[PDB]
Symmetry: C3
Subunit: 316 residues, 3 copies
């Protein structure tokens, strides 16, 4: 009985078009994603890994719906892939049908549907029995935003409207090394499993990056904004704690654990986003220049890759 509306997901950090304040009532929003396993270069030294992704990107695209809409996803696992995948949504309640029904082997496809009853930004990631850590730390995760029917509100209940929105997915990678110390390459994901588990148990990442690779959000790929623009930055980490910080700016309004029924925190310099969570920060640029966006464990940002840039224009 509910009207359906198709959406075309875009590669992060960008987000598909949508209305902050819903212009209708509940609806069934239809999304589509194609799982893609592929080699990926994550740093400047040509370090390669077998990434497992949603739509060929790390992180997966940001989905945006409104409180009480129905999210319908068509997940496709082409026969070009070699592994089983089972998507999991933190915004949903229950098993969504059961592993047997959600699970998708190479050459299969399935449709999921659940009601987004809670407003906020949530993490979605793969959860294949016995290999959860592996898929998640291979890039198989993203986030979905469930906006309150009439947009975001400040601590006073007054509206907060953003002019721009970016989705920064933080990914921790655990690239296995040999005896010498050199990183290792593999022909297929499976051959990497053995060493991958061993590397993950060290609990020490070799790389921590935004949008899939070192520098992915710097240079000409830097995020953009103009003096006076209100920007919303959705940040997620599906497996490890992170602490975002906007160098030269602040988090005017922050939902560190990303759930909008809770009023936001003000004037945050840095905020902690727990592993397995998505967070959202709201900031209004008052000056031009270059603003870095980092994980404030500076070793993780400047050594392992967790840093990006914000190019802001306008007159000083």
């Amino acid at each position: 009985t509910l009207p359906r509306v198709k959406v075309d997901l875009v590669k992060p950090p960008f987000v598909h078009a949508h209305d902050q304040v819903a212009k209708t009532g509940p609806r069934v929003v239809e999304f589509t994603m194609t799982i893609e396993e592929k080699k990926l270069v994550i740093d400047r030294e040509g370090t390669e890994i077998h990434a497992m992704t949603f739509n060929g990107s790390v992180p997966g695209p940001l989905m945006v719906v409104h409180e009480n809409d129905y999210v319908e996803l068509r997940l496709i696992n082409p026969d070009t892939n070699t592994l089983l995948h089972n998507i999991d949504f933190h915004a949903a309640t229950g098993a969504l049908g059961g592993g047997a029904l959600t699970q998708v082997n190479p050459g299969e496809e399935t449709t999921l549907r659940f009601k987004a009853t809670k407003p906020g930004v949530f993490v979605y990631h793969c959860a294949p029995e016995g290999m959860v850590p592996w898929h998640v730390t291979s890039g198989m995760n993203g986030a979905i935003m469930v906006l309150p029917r009439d947009g975001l509100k400040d601590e006073k209940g007054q509206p907060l409207t953003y002019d721009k929105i970016y989705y920064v997915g933080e990914q921790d990678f655990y690239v296995p090394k040999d005896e010498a110390g050199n990183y290792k390459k593999y022909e297929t994901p499976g051959e990497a499993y053995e060493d991958a588990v061993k590397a993950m148990r060290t609990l020490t990442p070799t790389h921590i990056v935004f949008n899939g690779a070192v520098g992915a959000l710097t240079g000409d790929h830097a995020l953009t904004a103009a003096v006076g623009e209100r920007v919303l930055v959705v940040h997620s980490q599906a497996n490890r704690d992170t602490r975002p910080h906007l160098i030269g700016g602040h988090g005017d309004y922050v939902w560190a654990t990303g759930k909008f029924r809770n009023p936001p925190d003000l004037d945050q310099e840095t905020w902690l986003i727990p592993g397995g969570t998505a967070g959202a920060a709201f900031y209004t640029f008052r000056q031009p220049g270059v603003y870095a966006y980092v994980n404030h464990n500076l070793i993780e940002a400047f050594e392992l890759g967790a840093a990006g840039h914000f190019k802001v224009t306008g007159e000083w």
Copy 2:
């Protein structure tokens, strides 16, 4: 000596001894008794053994429940069968190092500790022998105590929150020493493992992280149970290292991440951070039947290190 007295018999986790959410009488002296027990314990599927230091023979120690402004009187017994000096620190107590400077007992002795529970919330209690604190805490000597508001739990709006079931999930990080051959080492006595224990703790990387003392301790047969419609409170603690609870398929409807009840709970949490040395409480109402997993959301720590349990929910 003016206050009425009541005796309570502690039970083994994840269960909690009988109690009233809404206090039925005024301040009382609640009497508890615990026997320290040093013993070999198997913590994983591979039969790995360690010398555990426990309160009442379990890891974690039992959950003590009292009401705000009651007096907690604990009789701590260290039988001569043990070999080490022990004591106990309550984060709920004031002065005397949480009562740690007053509860030093050698094997063959016993002591009675008493303090007023002036602050509502869940607190961690752990052993703190001078010179060997981390060693005892990471050997399993820690638990938690809940000081309920005299009027029970309330939501972010001041309305009562009543739970039908309560479970105490204690997360424990173990640092089992390995030899040059990469194998886990065994010992004749606790003190015989000190040197290696300290060297293993300084790596800051746990070999195991478990719920209720061992891998799978809360899975399968020993899975937590609930029925559709039941409100469940889950008290979760970690005496030494940060943790991030997540109920797969569910949420934290009302959460006190740092566990202090005078602070309004956070709503719709997908995952929440409980700091090392803190006890947290999450309230959830099951809507769909099935097996819900309860994990530490650093998926490597949960699925590779043991921090994962199960929730068997019945109903339609």
Copy 3:
């Protein structure tokens, strides 16, 4: 706009100030001299090349009122060998607009920004391409921007402290050799290579309060008297920490240190994110000794994140 000059003191102590502003907006002037020097951080005599503001780790705590202007005269004497560039989490924009603020040995620069947001903020070195090395070498501190009307509890009522202490927690990554022994270098430049290798392990060899193991114990223990209201500013420019007052509590806590937000009550332990400064308010009710620790007990009692509070009274 009026200008006053204030003299900074070595932490854990804080320069005198008013909790409630007695005047309107002003320009508070501070001066700091960078100082690279060898430093012993543990009782085993382990030495490192510390990069510091005013010769101490952490740097001194600066205190101003919301909307005051902070003007800092940063001096990098020629007796140093590295270039430095200060960064303030309290400031908006990249301070140095018309001119660069980096300062090579033998140069100085003046910095000025408006403290528009109340709370405690981290300030630390941020040199192009060596940020983590300087920050983990001690070059960081904090600045408190008090609300004009002083602190308030969750009910909007005033909170006044009798004492204030600044505890800077520092994580060090001292490089080891083949045999597992800490390495020593002649200058900070010679250590760079091994330093980056040590930091990449993400595992500190030392985590200390006020620059060294035990720096806040014994004769240097923090002091208070029963009945006194104490405010403890705690910062960590690079790694998460979880303060805990053994035998006490955080009656009022601003874990992420921002005052426009009501504090949390009755905290046993609170998480302060890396790159953040937090503040805890407590009223001592009993005499005796109290420990102040990072509640990852291994980091506290094995790595050095522990200090003492000697309290007198009835």
